[PDB]
Amino acid sequence: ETHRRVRLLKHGSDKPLGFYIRDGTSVRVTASGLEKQPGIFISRLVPGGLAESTGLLAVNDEVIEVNGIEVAGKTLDQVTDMMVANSSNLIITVKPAN
């Protein structure tokens, strides 16, 4: 599988995970062939932030699931809420851009 699971071990309750997400499009494979579908992607990393420090997350990476739950069919607002809830010990499944 091309998917990669990243665990962000945060300590500061106020300090953010260190990244931004945006709406995007993903041309995933299907039966009839490649097809476009909505998706969530990392737009950028906070300088000096936790996410950047790990070196496991990068811009354009696609968020597939948050702590075991797929983000497919959800809005940017809903996915954002899903992540801040697991800030303490967040596990994110992504699909590397590069």
């Binding site: 953010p16 995970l17 990244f19 931004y20 997400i21 945006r22 709406d23 737009s43 954002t80 992540m83």
Partner: peptide, 6 residues
């Protein structure tokens, strides 16, 4: 682009 910080 609209982005959301986490």
């Amino acid at each position: 682009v609209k982005e959301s910080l986490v």
